[PDB]
């Protein structure tokens, strides 16, 4: 089946942060309004037998002292008085500040995404589902002992760790967010079994700053993980077609060479033309074909067990519009059953948020650099396969580009 993570408590926690507000409710309620929920298997978030088991899972990646600090931050924000100077210094030491502030539910909110994405990986491993979706997950910036970019716990890293250890097992991670997937890339920098690939904007001063030239050179992993971290940085303004042609051949070549056992996809919606970032010009159109739907369709055509996660996306109704179409397309590709979605938003709880026109399309009217990157990336893929003693014909792959 196609699985999707939701639940009453899960919904409440995912809607409890100051930055993402009620976005998750819009997404799941638009999916429901389009009558997709009967087609999907509900995957319940993971819960644990004890505090010690919870810590054992989360500290598979994060440090005990960082988890302690994040939980203390929640407790301090549930009291009336301000932080002490010593507690401020403590939170500063883990970057629990500025763009990663405290709020009354910060630990439960962050933990919930881990619970959902771990539960999703388990549903793939036991073969209950062929694909699982978690629109509450996808927080790719968090590090072992550091919050970053409103990411406090890295649910992606923990989900991937569960997949690679279920065994040889290899995972391909594809990061479609506007931003570089630095936290996931870093966690697996020395690991050849998890190949990471992020496409993103990069430019001087733009967050988080990595995933680009370091004549400077491209770092790409280390140790036995050399050549296992891939990046495609793109200039602002790119449309659906140029973005699709940029990543399409890379995706096909990665699958041919790596032969992954699982694929994990981060589908942050901040590349939409209507995102307040206003950097890329992608759409959710489905006849121009949305770069997002082009990529998901290609990935799903591989017939490899796949985890689809959320991420960025700061125009909440347009993020719901996109993720509803990704959800419908996943059902259609996996089940071979046609999903017909009306071009008009159906009546439901949040109908008023899709004014003034109430349509499913977003409200938008629409290379020598990329050829150079393709040559660079093809040579890196060759070096990866040589180092890891992997089989493949340079011809079938070269001709993809
Ligand atoms: C440090 O800033 C960020 C770090 C990570 C991400 C992200 O999406 N990562 O994948 C995004 C931002 N930036 C913003 O949220 C900017 C913004 C957008 C809408 C309304 C107000 C401000
Ligand atoms: K990305
Ligand atoms: K790696
Ligand atoms: Zn982002």
PDB file of C-alpha atoms in Angstrom, residues 15-320:
ATOM      1  CA  UNK A  15       0.638  22.473  14.569  1.00  0.00           C
ATOM      2  CA  UNK A  16       2.164  23.784  17.822  1.00  0.00           C
ATOM      3  CA  UNK A  17       5.246  25.700  16.525  1.00  0.00           C
ATOM      4  CA  UNK A  18       5.375  29.475  15.992  1.00  0.00           C
ATOM      5  CA  UNK A  19       7.115  29.192  12.612  1.00  0.00           C
ATOM      6  CA  UNK A  20       5.004  26.568  10.800  1.00  0.00           C
ATOM      7  CA  UNK A  21       1.722  27.284  12.626  1.00  0.00           C
ATOM      8  CA  UNK A  22      -1.208  25.250  11.279  1.00  0.00           C
ATOM      9  CA  UNK A  23       0.438  24.279   7.949  1.00  0.00           C
ATOM     10  CA  UNK A  24       0.206  20.538   8.663  1.00  0.00           C
ATOM     11  CA  UNK A  25      -3.557  20.751   9.276  1.00  0.00           C
ATOM     12  CA  UNK A  26      -4.104  22.504   5.930  1.00  0.00           C
ATOM     13  CA  UNK A  27      -2.057  19.834   4.140  1.00  0.00           C
ATOM     14  CA  UNK A  28      -3.869  16.858   5.658  1.00  0.00           C
ATOM     15  CA  UNK A  29      -7.292  18.538   5.391  1.00  0.00           C
ATOM     16  CA  UNK A  30      -6.788  19.330   1.694  1.00  0.00           C
ATOM     17  CA  UNK A  31      -5.757  15.687   1.162  1.00  0.00           C
ATOM     18  CA  UNK A  32      -8.922  14.601   3.009  1.00  0.00           C
ATOM     19  CA  UNK A  33     -11.183  17.048   1.147  1.00  0.00           C
ATOM     20  CA  UNK A  34      -9.997  15.484  -2.136  1.00  0.00           C
ATOM     21  CA  UNK A  35     -11.116  12.012  -0.904  1.00  0.00           C
ATOM     22  CA  UNK A  36      -7.578  10.554  -0.882  1.00  0.00           C
ATOM     23  CA  UNK A  37      -7.555   9.260   2.722  1.00  0.00           C
ATOM     24  CA  UNK A  38      -9.550   6.046   1.936  1.00  0.00           C
ATOM     25  CA  UNK A  39      -6.800   5.166  -0.601  1.00  0.00           C
ATOM     26  CA  UNK A  40      -4.026   5.432   2.015  1.00  0.00           C
ATOM     27  CA  UNK A  41      -2.952   3.323   4.992  1.00  0.00           C
ATOM     28  CA  UNK A  42      -2.529   5.352   8.198  1.00  0.00           C
ATOM     29  CA  UNK A  43       0.926   4.778   9.726  1.00  0.00           C
ATOM     30  CA  UNK A  44       0.820   5.651  13.483  1.00  0.00           C
ATOM     31  CA  UNK A  45       3.762   7.560  15.001  1.00  0.00           C
ATOM     32  CA  UNK A  46       6.209   5.468  17.000  1.00  0.00           C
ATOM     33  CA  UNK A  47       5.901   5.554  20.785  1.00  0.00           C
ATOM     34  CA  UNK A  48       8.354   4.084  23.291  1.00  0.00           C
ATOM     35  CA  UNK A  49       8.206   1.816  26.352  1.00  0.00           C
ATOM     36  CA  UNK A  50      10.141   4.232  28.590  1.00  0.00           C
ATOM     37  CA  UNK A  51      12.232   7.432  28.762  1.00  0.00           C
ATOM     38  CA  UNK A  52      15.374   5.290  28.433  1.00  0.00           C
ATOM     39  CA  UNK A  53      14.116   3.704  25.211  1.00  0.00           C
ATOM     40  CA  UNK A  54      13.195   7.145  23.855  1.00  0.00           C
ATOM     41  CA  UNK A  55      16.712   8.433  24.577  1.00  0.00           C
ATOM     42  CA  UNK A  56      18.278   5.328  23.048  1.00  0.00           C
ATOM     43  CA  UNK A  57      16.472   6.036  19.765  1.00  0.00           C
ATOM     44  CA  UNK A  58      17.132   9.774  19.599  1.00  0.00           C
ATOM     45  CA  UNK A  59      20.782   9.487  20.687  1.00  0.00           C
ATOM     46  CA  UNK A  60      21.417   7.101  17.804  1.00  0.00           C
ATOM     47  CA  UNK A  61      22.340  10.444  16.201  1.00  0.00           C
ATOM     48  CA  UNK A  62      22.099  13.354  18.676  1.00  0.00           C
ATOM     49  CA  UNK A  63      24.257  13.761  21.787  1.00  0.00           C
ATOM     50  CA  UNK A  64      22.741  13.036  25.192  1.00  0.00           C
ATOM     51  CA  UNK A  65      23.684  16.535  26.342  1.00  0.00           C
ATOM     52  CA  UNK A  66      21.930  18.126  23.360  1.00  0.00           C
ATOM     53  CA  UNK A  67      18.740  16.123  23.990  1.00  0.00           C
ATOM     54  CA  UNK A  68      18.929  17.103  27.675  1.00  0.00           C
ATOM     55  CA  UNK A  69      19.261  20.787  26.696  1.00  0.00           C
ATOM     56  CA  UNK A  70      16.335  20.664  24.265  1.00  0.00           C
ATOM     57  CA  UNK A  71      14.105  19.049  26.899  1.00  0.00           C
ATOM     58  CA  UNK A  72      15.224  21.602  29.496  1.00  0.00           C
ATOM     59  CA  UNK A  73      14.392  24.393  27.029  1.00  0.00           C
ATOM     60  CA  UNK A  74      10.797  23.125  26.816  1.00  0.00           C
ATOM     61  CA  UNK A  75      10.483  22.965  30.605  1.00  0.00           C
ATOM     62  CA  UNK A  76      11.836  26.505  31.032  1.00  0.00           C
ATOM     63  CA  UNK A  77       9.387  27.836  28.474  1.00  0.00           C
ATOM     64  CA  UNK A  78       6.466  26.304  30.400  1.00  0.00           C
ATOM     65  CA  UNK A  79       7.237  28.502  33.448  1.00  0.00           C
ATOM     66  CA  UNK A  80       6.653  32.213  33.947  1.00  0.00           C
ATOM     67  CA  UNK A  81      10.124  33.528  34.789  1.00  0.00           C
ATOM     68  CA  UNK A  82      12.890  34.374  32.345  1.00  0.00           C
ATOM     69  CA  UNK A  83      15.985  32.260  31.740  1.00  0.00           C
ATOM     70  CA  UNK A  84      18.995  32.634  34.000  1.00  0.00           C
ATOM     71  CA  UNK A  85      22.276  33.852  32.532  1.00  0.00           C
ATOM     72  CA  UNK A  86      23.751  30.366  32.972  1.00  0.00           C
ATOM     73  CA  UNK A  87      20.795  28.788  31.163  1.00  0.00           C
ATOM     74  CA  UNK A  88      21.084  31.304  28.287  1.00  0.00           C
ATOM     75  CA  UNK A  89      24.770  30.358  27.881  1.00  0.00           C
ATOM     76  CA  UNK A  90      23.796  26.677  27.910  1.00  0.00           C
ATOM     77  CA  UNK A  91      21.217  27.138  25.149  1.00  0.00           C
ATOM     78  CA  UNK A  92      23.666  29.280  23.154  1.00  0.00           C
ATOM     79  CA  UNK A  93      26.187  26.424  23.281  1.00  0.00           C
ATOM     80  CA  UNK A  94      23.707  24.275  21.272  1.00  0.00           C
ATOM     81  CA  UNK A  95      22.459  27.124  19.012  1.00  0.00           C
ATOM     82  CA  UNK A  96      19.072  26.915  20.749  1.00  0.00           C
ATOM     83  CA  UNK A  97      18.484  30.583  19.995  1.00  0.00           C
ATOM     84  CA  UNK A  98      17.838  33.137  17.252  1.00  0.00           C
ATOM     85  CA  UNK A  99      16.202  31.127  14.460  1.00  0.00           C
ATOM     86  CA  UNK A 100      15.764  28.085  16.751  1.00  0.00           C
ATOM     87  CA  UNK A 101      14.018  29.678  19.752  1.00  0.00           C
ATOM     88  CA  UNK A 102      12.247  27.988  22.624  1.00  0.00           C
ATOM     89  CA  UNK A 103       8.485  27.661  22.927  1.00  0.00           C
ATOM     90  CA  UNK A 104       6.208  25.670  25.269  1.00  0.00           C
ATOM     91  CA  UNK A 105       6.100  22.528  23.075  1.00  0.00           C
ATOM     92  CA  UNK A 106       9.545  22.709  21.436  1.00  0.00           C
ATOM     93  CA  UNK A 107      10.665  19.219  22.571  1.00  0.00           C
ATOM     94  CA  UNK A 108       7.357  17.371  21.943  1.00  0.00           C
ATOM     95  CA  UNK A 109       7.031  19.168  18.574  1.00  0.00           C
ATOM     96  CA  UNK A 110      10.566  18.177  17.516  1.00  0.00           C
ATOM     97  CA  UNK A 111      10.215  14.621  18.866  1.00  0.00           C
ATOM     98  CA  UNK A 112       6.937  14.114  17.018  1.00  0.00           C
ATOM     99  CA  UNK A 113       8.659  14.399  13.613  1.00  0.00           C
ATOM    100  CA  UNK A 114      11.143  11.708  14.698  1.00  0.00           C
ATOM    101  CA  UNK A 115       8.248   9.499  15.864  1.00  0.00           C
ATOM    102  CA  UNK A 116       6.518   9.787  12.497  1.00  0.00           C
ATOM    103  CA  UNK A 117       9.590   9.228  10.327  1.00  0.00           C
ATOM    104  CA  UNK A 118      10.836   6.265  12.394  1.00  0.00           C
ATOM    105  CA  UNK A 119       7.364   4.716  12.118  1.00  0.00           C
ATOM    106  CA  UNK A 120       7.472   5.298   8.347  1.00  0.00           C
ATOM    107  CA  UNK A 121      10.844   3.537   7.952  1.00  0.00           C
ATOM    108  CA  UNK A 122       9.511   0.543   9.932  1.00  0.00           C
ATOM    109  CA  UNK A 123       6.494   0.288   7.615  1.00  0.00           C
ATOM    110  CA  UNK A 124       8.879   0.061   4.641  1.00  0.00           C
ATOM    111  CA  UNK A 125      11.210  -2.461   6.289  1.00  0.00           C
ATOM    112  CA  UNK A 126       8.429  -4.920   7.193  1.00  0.00           C
ATOM    113  CA  UNK A 127       6.993  -4.424   3.646  1.00  0.00           C
ATOM    114  CA  UNK A 128       3.588  -3.286   4.960  1.00  0.00           C
ATOM    115  CA  UNK A 129       3.939  -0.326   2.553  1.00  0.00           C
ATOM    116  CA  UNK A 130       5.747   0.253  -0.761  1.00  0.00           C
ATOM    117  CA  UNK A 131       5.908   4.038  -0.156  1.00  0.00           C
ATOM    118  CA  UNK A 132       5.236   6.055   2.994  1.00  0.00           C
ATOM    119  CA  UNK A 133       4.533   9.809   3.225  1.00  0.00           C
ATOM    120  CA  UNK A 134       5.266  12.017   6.263  1.00  0.00           C
ATOM    121  CA  UNK A 135       4.284  15.656   5.729  1.00  0.00           C
ATOM    122  CA  UNK A 136       5.196  16.339   9.389  1.00  0.00           C
ATOM    123  CA  UNK A 137       8.820  15.317   8.792  1.00  0.00           C
ATOM    124  CA  UNK A 138      11.831  16.369   6.737  1.00  0.00           C
ATOM    125  CA  UNK A 139      13.967  18.533   9.030  1.00  0.00           C
ATOM    126  CA  UNK A 140      17.300  18.256   7.236  1.00  0.00           C
ATOM    127  CA  UNK A 141      19.383  20.990   8.974  1.00  0.00           C
ATOM    128  CA  UNK A 142      19.692  19.618  12.536  1.00  0.00           C
ATOM    129  CA  UNK A 143      23.144  18.381  13.599  1.00  0.00           C
ATOM    130  CA  UNK A 144      24.362  15.955  16.260  1.00  0.00           C
ATOM    131  CA  UNK A 145      24.566  18.698  18.915  1.00  0.00           C
ATOM    132  CA  UNK A 146      23.161  21.795  17.178  1.00  0.00           C
ATOM    133  CA  UNK A 147      19.795  23.182  16.096  1.00  0.00           C
ATOM    134  CA  UNK A 148      19.752  24.995  12.751  1.00  0.00           C
ATOM    135  CA  UNK A 149      17.174  26.552  10.415  1.00  0.00           C
ATOM    136  CA  UNK A 150      14.185  25.817  12.743  1.00  0.00           C
ATOM    137  CA  UNK A 151      15.260  22.149  12.711  1.00  0.00           C
ATOM    138  CA  UNK A 152      15.797  20.812  16.236  1.00  0.00           C
ATOM    139  CA  UNK A 153      15.944  17.012  15.723  1.00  0.00           C
ATOM    140  CA  UNK A 154      16.974  15.366  12.455  1.00  0.00           C
ATOM    141  CA  UNK A 155      14.168  12.894  11.743  1.00  0.00           C
ATOM    142  CA  UNK A 156      15.682  12.155   8.322  1.00  0.00           C
ATOM    143  CA  UNK A 157      19.044  10.997   9.675  1.00  0.00           C
ATOM    144  CA  UNK A 158      17.331   8.793  12.272  1.00  0.00           C
ATOM    145  CA  UNK A 159      14.956   7.330   9.672  1.00  0.00           C
ATOM    146  CA  UNK A 160      17.868   6.599   7.286  1.00  0.00           C
ATOM    147  CA  UNK A 161      19.940   5.015  10.068  1.00  0.00           C
ATOM    148  CA  UNK A 162      17.043   2.633  10.756  1.00  0.00           C
ATOM    149  CA  UNK A 163      16.836   1.705   7.051  1.00  0.00           C
ATOM    150  CA  UNK A 164      20.567   1.092   6.488  1.00  0.00           C
ATOM    151  CA  UNK A 165      20.808  -1.022   9.629  1.00  0.00           C
ATOM    152  CA  UNK A 166      17.821  -3.247   8.752  1.00  0.00           C
ATOM    153  CA  UNK A 167      20.148  -5.547   6.757  1.00  0.00           C
ATOM    154  CA  UNK A 168      24.440  -5.081   1.336  1.00  0.00           C
ATOM    155  CA  UNK A 169      21.895  -2.339   2.109  1.00  0.00           C
ATOM    156  CA  UNK A 170      22.257   1.047   0.394  1.00  0.00           C
ATOM    157  CA  UNK A 171      20.067   4.171   0.695  1.00  0.00           C
ATOM    158  CA  UNK A 172      19.782   7.012  -1.819  1.00  0.00           C
ATOM    159  CA  UNK A 173      18.790  10.341  -0.230  1.00  0.00           C
ATOM    160  CA  UNK A 174      17.371  13.017  -2.592  1.00  0.00           C
ATOM    161  CA  UNK A 175      16.850  16.548  -1.212  1.00  0.00           C
ATOM    162  CA  UNK A 176      14.570  18.763  -3.346  1.00  0.00           C
ATOM    163  CA  UNK A 177      14.307  21.645  -0.840  1.00  0.00           C
ATOM    164  CA  UNK A 178      15.310  25.198  -1.793  1.00  0.00           C
ATOM    165  CA  UNK A 179      18.089  24.858   0.803  1.00  0.00           C
ATOM    166  CA  UNK A 180      21.147  22.587   0.939  1.00  0.00           C
ATOM    167  CA  UNK A 181      20.546  19.421   2.952  1.00  0.00           C
ATOM    168  CA  UNK A 182      23.641  20.014   5.119  1.00  0.00           C
ATOM    169  CA  UNK A 183      22.697  18.054   8.258  1.00  0.00           C
ATOM    170  CA  UNK A 184      21.937  14.806   6.417  1.00  0.00           C
ATOM    171  CA  UNK A 185      24.993  15.167   4.177  1.00  0.00           C
ATOM    172  CA  UNK A 186      27.215  15.733   7.226  1.00  0.00           C
ATOM    173  CA  UNK A 187      25.836  12.777   9.231  1.00  0.00           C
ATOM    174  CA  UNK A 188      26.754  10.408   6.374  1.00  0.00           C
ATOM    175  CA  UNK A 189      29.954  12.149   5.168  1.00  0.00           C
ATOM    176  CA  UNK A 190      32.077   9.051   5.926  1.00  0.00           C
ATOM    177  CA  UNK A 191      29.488   6.432   4.920  1.00  0.00           C
ATOM    178  CA  UNK A 192      29.485   4.981   1.371  1.00  0.00           C
ATOM    179  CA  UNK A 193      26.223   3.065   1.999  1.00  0.00           C
ATOM    180  CA  UNK A 194      24.140   6.282   2.234  1.00  0.00           C
ATOM    181  CA  UNK A 195      24.601   8.374  -0.936  1.00  0.00           C
ATOM    182  CA  UNK A 196      23.204  11.901  -0.511  1.00  0.00           C
ATOM    183  CA  UNK A 197      22.145  14.218  -3.359  1.00  0.00           C
ATOM    184  CA  UNK A 198      20.862  17.767  -2.792  1.00  0.00           C
ATOM    185  CA  UNK A 199      19.705  20.255  -5.440  1.00  0.00           C
ATOM    186  CA  UNK A 200      19.293  23.777  -4.090  1.00  0.00           C
ATOM    187  CA  UNK A 201      19.981  27.467  -4.465  1.00  0.00           C
ATOM    188  CA  UNK A 202      23.401  28.667  -3.321  1.00  0.00           C
ATOM    189  CA  UNK A 203      24.809  32.208  -3.438  1.00  0.00           C
ATOM    190  CA  UNK A 204      26.965  34.434  -1.185  1.00  0.00           C
ATOM    191  CA  UNK A 205      25.346  34.876   2.232  1.00  0.00           C
ATOM    192  CA  UNK A 206      22.404  32.551   1.461  1.00  0.00           C
ATOM    193  CA  UNK A 207      21.546  29.965   4.165  1.00  0.00           C
ATOM    194  CA  UNK A 208      23.240  27.636   5.177  1.00  0.00           C
ATOM    195  CA  UNK A 209      26.144  28.315   2.815  1.00  0.00           C
ATOM    196  CA  UNK A 210      27.278  24.771   1.915  1.00  0.00           C
ATOM    197  CA  UNK A 211      26.552  22.517  -1.076  1.00  0.00           C
ATOM    198  CA  UNK A 212      28.726  24.551  -3.451  1.00  0.00           C
ATOM    199  CA  UNK A 213      32.299  25.498  -4.389  1.00  0.00           C
ATOM    200  CA  UNK A 214      34.552  25.377  -1.334  1.00  0.00           C
ATOM    201  CA  UNK A 215      40.458  27.347  -8.258  1.00  0.00           C
ATOM    202  CA  UNK A 216      38.068  26.248  -5.462  1.00  0.00           C
ATOM    203  CA  UNK A 217      36.750  22.676  -5.462  1.00  0.00           C
ATOM    204  CA  UNK A 218      33.709  20.627  -4.488  1.00  0.00           C
ATOM    205  CA  UNK A 219      34.046  18.545  -1.322  1.00  0.00           C
ATOM    206  CA  UNK A 220      32.186  15.247  -1.729  1.00  0.00           C
ATOM    207  CA  UNK A 221      32.700  12.986   1.322  1.00  0.00           C
ATOM    208  CA  UNK A 222      35.672  11.589   3.212  1.00  0.00           C
ATOM    209  CA  UNK A 223      37.265   8.311   4.240  1.00  0.00           C
ATOM    210  CA  UNK A 224      35.444   5.349   2.767  1.00  0.00           C
ATOM    211  CA  UNK A 225      32.664   7.903   2.066  1.00  0.00           C
ATOM    212  CA  UNK A 226      34.738   9.825  -0.498  1.00  0.00           C
ATOM    213  CA  UNK A 227      32.654  10.728  -3.611  1.00  0.00           C
ATOM    214  CA  UNK A 228      29.384   9.770  -1.795  1.00  0.00           C
ATOM    215  CA  UNK A 229      27.930  13.292  -1.244  1.00  0.00           C
ATOM    216  CA  UNK A 230      26.488  14.955  -4.378  1.00  0.00           C
ATOM    217  CA  UNK A 231      25.339  18.561  -4.869  1.00  0.00           C
ATOM    218  CA  UNK A 232      23.802  20.629  -7.676  1.00  0.00           C
ATOM    219  CA  UNK A 233      23.723  24.350  -6.799  1.00  0.00           C
ATOM    220  CA  UNK A 234      21.502  26.423  -9.104  1.00  0.00           C
ATOM    221  CA  UNK A 235      21.115  30.123  -9.889  1.00  0.00           C
ATOM    222  CA  UNK A 236      17.963  31.962  -8.831  1.00  0.00           C
ATOM    223  CA  UNK A 237      15.013  32.101 -11.247  1.00  0.00           C
ATOM    224  CA  UNK A 238      14.991  28.544 -12.634  1.00  0.00           C
ATOM    225  CA  UNK A 239      11.680  27.226 -14.007  1.00  0.00           C
ATOM    226  CA  UNK A 240      10.047  23.772 -14.024  1.00  0.00           C
ATOM    227  CA  UNK A 241      11.578  22.636 -17.325  1.00  0.00           C
ATOM    228  CA  UNK A 242      15.182  23.726 -16.739  1.00  0.00           C
ATOM    229  CA  UNK A 243      15.123  22.347 -13.161  1.00  0.00           C
ATOM    230  CA  UNK A 244      13.718  19.021 -14.407  1.00  0.00           C
ATOM    231  CA  UNK A 245      16.331  18.681 -17.167  1.00  0.00           C
ATOM    232  CA  UNK A 246      19.030  19.639 -14.652  1.00  0.00           C
ATOM    233  CA  UNK A 247      18.224  16.882 -12.134  1.00  0.00           C
ATOM    234  CA  UNK A 248      16.591  14.217 -14.352  1.00  0.00           C
ATOM    235  CA  UNK A 249      19.739  12.613 -15.785  1.00  0.00           C
ATOM    236  CA  UNK A 250      21.516  12.752 -12.397  1.00  0.00           C
ATOM    237  CA  UNK A 251      18.651  10.870 -10.712  1.00  0.00           C
ATOM    238  CA  UNK A 252      18.578   8.135 -13.355  1.00  0.00           C
ATOM    239  CA  UNK A 253      22.360   7.726 -13.239  1.00  0.00           C
ATOM    240  CA  UNK A 254      22.392   7.526  -9.422  1.00  0.00           C
ATOM    241  CA  UNK A 255      19.769   4.758  -9.459  1.00  0.00           C
ATOM    242  CA  UNK A 256      21.533   2.750 -12.196  1.00  0.00           C
ATOM    243  CA  UNK A 257      24.920   2.909 -10.479  1.00  0.00           C
ATOM    244  CA  UNK A 258      23.893   2.750  -6.795  1.00  0.00           C
ATOM    245  CA  UNK A 259      21.014   0.244  -7.125  1.00  0.00           C
ATOM    246  CA  UNK A 260      19.543   1.521  -3.827  1.00  0.00           C
ATOM    247  CA  UNK A 261      17.537  -0.686  -1.471  1.00  0.00           C
ATOM    248  CA  UNK A 262      15.550   2.355  -0.246  1.00  0.00           C
ATOM    249  CA  UNK A 263      15.056   5.916  -1.473  1.00  0.00           C
ATOM    250  CA  UNK A 264      14.391   8.793   0.928  1.00  0.00           C
ATOM    251  CA  UNK A 265      13.079  12.041  -0.614  1.00  0.00           C
ATOM    252  CA  UNK A 266      12.889  15.445   1.078  1.00  0.00           C
ATOM    253  CA  UNK A 267      10.209  17.462  -0.747  1.00  0.00           C
ATOM    254  CA  UNK A 268      10.435  20.936   0.794  1.00  0.00           C
ATOM    255  CA  UNK A 269       8.039  23.257  -1.075  1.00  0.00           C
ATOM    256  CA  UNK A 270      10.063  26.460  -0.848  1.00  0.00           C
ATOM    257  CA  UNK A 271      11.097  26.204  -4.548  1.00  0.00           C
ATOM    258  CA  UNK A 272       7.537  27.161  -5.567  1.00  0.00           C
ATOM    259  CA  UNK A 273       7.323  30.414  -7.518  1.00  0.00           C
ATOM    260  CA  UNK A 274       4.790  31.624  -4.922  1.00  0.00           C
ATOM    261  CA  UNK A 275       6.947  30.891  -1.876  1.00  0.00           C
ATOM    262  CA  UNK A 276       7.835  34.157  -0.061  1.00  0.00           C
ATOM    263  CA  UNK A 277      11.513  33.329  -0.650  1.00  0.00           C
ATOM    264  CA  UNK A 278      10.816  34.098  -4.333  1.00  0.00           C
ATOM    265  CA  UNK A 279      14.037  32.442  -5.557  1.00  0.00           C
ATOM    266  CA  UNK A 280      13.038  29.531  -7.839  1.00  0.00           C
ATOM    267  CA  UNK A 281       9.998  29.410 -10.171  1.00  0.00           C
ATOM    268  CA  UNK A 282       8.671  25.852  -9.808  1.00  0.00           C
ATOM    269  CA  UNK A 283       4.917  25.110  -9.851  1.00  0.00           C
ATOM    270  CA  UNK A 284       2.510  22.316  -8.900  1.00  0.00           C
ATOM    271  CA  UNK A 285       1.138  22.143 -12.470  1.00  0.00           C
ATOM    272  CA  UNK A 286       0.081  18.747 -13.847  1.00  0.00           C
ATOM    273  CA  UNK A 287      -0.990  18.807 -17.517  1.00  0.00           C
ATOM    274  CA  UNK A 288       4.614  22.961 -17.993  1.00  0.00           C
ATOM    275  CA  UNK A 289       4.956  19.954 -15.666  1.00  0.00           C
ATOM    276  CA  UNK A 290       5.858  20.734 -12.048  1.00  0.00           C
ATOM    277  CA  UNK A 291       9.511  19.920 -11.427  1.00  0.00           C
ATOM    278  CA  UNK A 292       8.413  18.333  -8.151  1.00  0.00           C
ATOM    279  CA  UNK A 293       5.926  15.951  -9.759  1.00  0.00           C
ATOM    280  CA  UNK A 294       8.433  15.158 -12.540  1.00  0.00           C
ATOM    281  CA  UNK A 295      11.041  14.123  -9.967  1.00  0.00           C
ATOM    282  CA  UNK A 296       8.685  12.079  -7.753  1.00  0.00           C
ATOM    283  CA  UNK A 297       7.267  10.283 -10.814  1.00  0.00           C
ATOM    284  CA  UNK A 298      10.763   9.381 -12.013  1.00  0.00           C
ATOM    285  CA  UNK A 299      11.852   8.180  -8.552  1.00  0.00           C
ATOM    286  CA  UNK A 300       8.697   6.058  -8.131  1.00  0.00           C
ATOM    287  CA  UNK A 301       9.200   4.481 -11.584  1.00  0.00           C
ATOM    288  CA  UNK A 302      12.244   2.728 -10.121  1.00  0.00           C
ATOM    289  CA  UNK A 303       9.952   0.505  -7.935  1.00  0.00           C
ATOM    290  CA  UNK A 304      12.246   0.844  -4.888  1.00  0.00           C
ATOM    291  CA  UNK A 305      10.681   1.166  -1.399  1.00  0.00           C
ATOM    292  CA  UNK A 306      10.506   4.916  -0.840  1.00  0.00           C
ATOM    293  CA  UNK A 307      10.051   7.417   1.993  1.00  0.00           C
ATOM    294  CA  UNK A 308       8.599  10.831   0.990  1.00  0.00           C
ATOM    295  CA  UNK A 309       9.010  13.630   3.557  1.00  0.00           C
ATOM    296  CA  UNK A 310       8.126  17.316   3.825  1.00  0.00           C
ATOM    297  CA  UNK A 311      10.400  20.195   4.798  1.00  0.00           C
ATOM    298  CA  UNK A 312      10.378  23.901   3.966  1.00  0.00           C
ATOM    299  CA  UNK A 313       7.389  25.725   2.547  1.00  0.00           C
ATOM    300  CA  UNK A 314       6.208  29.099   3.813  1.00  0.00           C
ATOM    301  CA  UNK A 315       3.150  29.724   1.621  1.00  0.00           C
ATOM    302  CA  UNK A 316       0.933  27.297   3.557  1.00  0.00           C
ATOM    303  CA  UNK A 317      -2.016  26.963   1.109  1.00  0.00           C
ATOM    304  CA  UNK A 318       0.329  26.577  -1.887  1.00  0.00           C
ATOM    305  CA  UNK A 319       2.385  24.005   0.032  1.00  0.00           C
ATOM    306  CA  UNK A 320      -0.851  22.080   0.664  1.00  0.00           C
TER     307      UNK A 320
END
